[PDB]
Write a protein that binds this ligand. Structure first.
Ligand code: FE
Ligand code: FE
Lengths: 442, 442
């Protein structure tokens, strides 16, 4: 595992040198390495130190970040975390003079952006007033949040200077935007009241944050695009091409008056207009479409009672019953589900998805999991309160001796649609070298 | 600025602790630190060391990479590189027992993915045969290639086991896919023959490579999507939502047989069908559409003589004359242009774009550049053969005392459209915190 990570780091060093058109001799000269030695660092015979990575960021126009791999802590492609481990991670935090939350980690991975916490509400309120002084608010946090409610939990949320309180119960859920302040209390001291607060990051975190942080606040603010504003998207692509209204009109076959009008409205153009504009701009129609959001006051609440329900693979012989939980079209790759596992057999493999997956066993019976990864088959059993992390691409099935429920949150990773289409365009054999460069570029 | 970068690293440390719901004392417990030291690290009283970052990656489900900022090496928003500096970076490479290429760096930044080399063709051929033994091929490299030709350069390229040669002349260009093998030679020893080989990264480099490398080649290949393949895109979203053909038909109003058939073809559904399917899947129609490509043999060649040209900002105000160079809809955010600078005054500012920009002066007269960044106005001059790098969001003008030509390559950075939608959805005032977290989460 450490040797595999070292190999990944060595491949990144060769890739960086190849990309800078530095062959072995040129890289040794730039990095102050002994003549003839570069192959020993690229092959793994010599370790790549933080000293060398720091020297490379000074000698070359790259960052220390560009030479570091990430860790693989999910070697079987799925990993379970046990209740005992979650309880050992316990943190109690006081707010307003008394204990307010108990936090427990659930299944996480260095390969994924999940930060999923079990959190019990320790503050009990006697009304649903958002301005109740017993409520201790947070400041909001960068990560998106999907929250699943168990018991009589009150959800408090703030946006544009107004505080709201929506009472929840078991099976309700909410999806929420970055930096939206919120809080949770219990309406009763008599029954369990807790949440699965499954926060996660996506594209905002990682490379985008590092880059935008160097540009500064003004440049970053100026790159923002408001959801649903198609005219702004069109203006942005026009600016990226350095085209003009009359030139785009001439190339697309649209009237100049129409192109100007489309630049000034959030409503999308008609489909034939979008196709003509896209071709004139050298982009797919995909790039002129802007997602809408369903959020209001920066959250989208899904009542469990009215949530969509369906059976898999179908009602004639159902293995699972799914309930659709809260999400948002700003994050089309986030799927949240309550899963009733009905089958006692391993006869219903779920289709592999490009998403990361997180599982948490809500029901009273254990769930047996069977999965495949890199030519091996594995099996395991999640007890109630156990959780699991699954990398993209894994085929697994679930079963239980009696019907039982689990919570499933699936999120997009860094392999976005654009990445996946780039992978699809690569010539045969190239994906291997993309994963781990193994040679000088000539 | 090392001090600013150290502050960025401190902020990432606070953010990582916030995301894991570790306050100061909890973080000190997890990391084995003495009491009070975690505040010292976040505040800057103690420097953040590789030892601390390594400890964090061992104790917490994060990567060392996640705690490192990138460098700001473009403090004025635009940075020029001079002929003398490019010449100083000269590297001569032999292939087949004699000189083949001279490489020279041009403007680059730790904030962008450009790897732009000036490259002189040192191998002279007497025919255009791709199997000529004087032609020495590379193995293909990870980065995308955008190449502008000067002089009688032969371009050689391989795809699918076949080798090709297209004789180029000044003003021709080509855009090429990752790992497509290629070469360049000169048809004459008696005139300059060289290229601007403006390689760059996109979606593939950085986070996505790091994650995919830990999943392995089998999973990574399974995630590929073929450009143009709408049925694969539909199947992907269906698998992400765990909707069968029958359930998606049920929701959308399309017949079961029609949904199944749309999953078996690259051709897109009809627009009303796409609208109904997207609504049923909780996504914008954008997520059922796919990029297409125009590449043949993995490249897209643009003859200079047939390239589209237009005046900017308009026909009746031609400050500049643009020539559209080689690109592809697989990279909608890549704009390649040859720019004839016609105005002698800085009276035609180019609108700010979300793209990074790279400039190289091709013509025989200097180009004056006036730009603004962070409330300050700057003036500079690019001599023939000088280059420049520009961060996103900069407004600049170009002027010259006589018409002169500049090569421009604009590429998308890590702030993808999805990042920009997310920035637009963020509550007002939170971009400061996104750039640099400055507080405990509660
Ligand atoms: Fe939260
Ligand atoms: Fe190349």
């Amino acid at each position: 595992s450490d040797a595999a990570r070292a190999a990944r780091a060595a491949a990144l060093l060769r890739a960086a040198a190849n990309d800078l058109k530095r062959n072995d001799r040129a890289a040794e000269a730039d990095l102050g390495l002994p003549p003839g030695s570069f192959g020993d660092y690229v092959s793994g015979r010599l370790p790549i130190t933080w000293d060398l990575i720091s020297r490379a960021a000074q000698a070359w126009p790259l960052n220390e970040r560009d030479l570091l791999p990430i860790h693989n802590d999910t070697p079987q492609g799925l990993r379970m975390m046990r209740v005992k481990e979650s309880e050992a991670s316990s943190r109690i935090i006081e707010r307003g003079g008394g204990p307010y939350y108990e936090y427990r980690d659930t299944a996480m991975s260095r390969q994924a952006s999940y930060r999923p916490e079990w959190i019990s509400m320790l503050r009990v309120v006697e009304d649903d007033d958002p301005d109740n002084p017993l409520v201790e608010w947070n400041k909001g946090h960068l990560l998106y949040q999907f929250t699943y409610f168990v018991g009589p939990v009150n959800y408090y949320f703030r946006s544009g200077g107004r505080s709201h309180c929506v009472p929840m119960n078991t099976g309700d859920s909410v999806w929420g935007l970055p930096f939206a302040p919120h809080s949770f209390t219990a309406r009763s001291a008599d029954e369990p009241a807790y949440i699965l607060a499954l926060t996660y990051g996506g594209e905002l975190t990682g490379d985008a944050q590092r880059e935008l942080a160097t540009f500064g606040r003004a440049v970053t603010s100026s790159l923002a695009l408001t959801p649903g504003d198609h005219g702004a998207m069109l203006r942005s692509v026009m600016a990226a091409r350095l085209t003009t209204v009359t030139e785009l009109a001439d190339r697309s076959g649209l009237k100049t008056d129409r192109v100007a009008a489309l630049c000034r409205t959030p409503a999308r153009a008609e489909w034939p207009e979008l196709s003509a504009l896209a071709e004139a701009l050298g982009v797919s129609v995909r790039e002129l479409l802007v997602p809408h959001t369903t959020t209001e006051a920066d959250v989208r609440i899904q009542p469990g009672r009215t949530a969509s329900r369906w059976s898999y693979p179908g009602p004639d012989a159902p293995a699972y019953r799914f309930t659709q939980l809260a999400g948002d079209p700003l994050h089309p790759h986030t799927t949240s589900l309550a899963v009733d596992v009905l089958t006692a057999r391993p006869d219903a493999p779920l289709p592999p998805t490009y998403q990361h997956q997180y599982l948490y066993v809500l029901g009273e019976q254990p769930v047996s999991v069977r999965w495949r990864y890199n030519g091996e088959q594995y099996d395991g059993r999640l007890e109630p309160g156990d959780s699991a992390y699954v990398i993209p691409g894994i085929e697994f099935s679930l079963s239980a001796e009696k019907p039982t429920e689990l919570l499933m949150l699936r999120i997009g990773g860094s392999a976005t649609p654009d990445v996946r289409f780039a992978l699809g365009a690569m010539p045969d054999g190239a994906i291997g070298r993309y994963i781990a460069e193994d040679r000088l570029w000539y």
